[PDB]
Design a protein around this ligand. Structure first.
Ligand SMILES: [Zn+2]
Length: 278
């Protein structure tokens, strides 16, 4: 009986709950901990999309391998974004868009709005209720932005350099006067160029960076092979991977862990950076 809303990533899974609460029935396609860049829609998945009353996804080719299915049946929460909002890099000609918009709280608040207006119009009777829920979460995102700022303000200008497995924090860095390096491009669907590894090594050396970060969606070996190369130039920069020491880029944490919800996933990321960068 409850409306069925298919949802690509754990990100959206959280958002909708935050907004619609228990009023709708959520169909998460990509399990937390998996990588949407590579996810390939299986029969069951396409089925979920088909059976869905509403389908919500990021867009910007984030899902990477379901554009020709989501664009057909679903609504990208990034439909309202404008050109200047976008981050754009280069890759074999073109002007490739950076999908990791959610670390730009403003952009995420935008997404939240689209999601709200789609759950409203899906539940006419719960529209005001949802709008009320939306406002409360918008404000929580507001408070969050202030939290991150105050939290980051403890990291020295010279230490404002983030190193991650791939380019997924451009929107983040842009929001808080940060510089991001990554041995990989915007998508994770490509071989780790050994020339970008070195590029990164030299960047670490240039800026005397003593901490490179690890993420839950990719193999941390890459960052340990990156650490080894640095030391090969002596060279010595810690790898933040340990246990529970992972940044979330392309996914939240499994319900329910510390990176459970979006705002918590955010705080987790932030605290982690300050600890090894401050
Ligand atoms: Zn990514």
């Amino acid at each position: 009986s409850k409306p069925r809303v298919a949802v690509t990533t754990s990100f959206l899974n959280d958002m909708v709950y935050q907004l619609a609460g228990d009023e709708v029935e959520r169909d998460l396609l990509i399990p937390a901990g998996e990588d949407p860049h590579l996810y390939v829609a299986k029969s069951s998945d396409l089925s979920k999309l088909q059976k869905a009353d509403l389908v919500l996804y990021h867009g910007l080719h984030f899902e990477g391998k379901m554009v020709e299915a989501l664009e057909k049946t679903g609504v990208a929460v990034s439909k309202n974004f404008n050109a200047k909002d976008l981050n754009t890099m280069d890759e074999d000609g073109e002007e490739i868009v950076d999908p990791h918009f959610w670390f730009s709280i403003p952009l995420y608040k935008s997404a939240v709005a689209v999601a709200s207006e789609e759950l409203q119009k899906l539940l006419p009777a719960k529209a005001e209720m949802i709008q009320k829920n939306t406002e409360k979460y918008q404000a929580q995102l507001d408070d969050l932005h202030a939290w991150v700022e105050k939290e980051l303000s403890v990291i020295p200008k010279e230490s404002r350099y983030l190193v991650t497995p791939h380019d997924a924090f451009n929107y983040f860095a842009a929001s808080y006067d940060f510089t991001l390096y990554a041995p990989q491009g915007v998508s994770t669907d490509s071989e780790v160029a050994n020339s970008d590894m070195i590029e990164t090594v030299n960047l670490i050396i240039d800026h005397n960076i003593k901490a490179i970060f690890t993420e839950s969606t990719t193999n941390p070996e890459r960052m340990k092979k990156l650490q080894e190369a640095v030391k090969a130039k002596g060279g010595q920069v810690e790898v933040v991977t340990g246990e529970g020491k992972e940044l979330f880029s392309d996914s939240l944490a499994p319900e329910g862990e510390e990176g459970d919800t979006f705002i918590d996933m955010y705080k987790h990321n932030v605290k982690l950076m300050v600890k090894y960068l401050k």
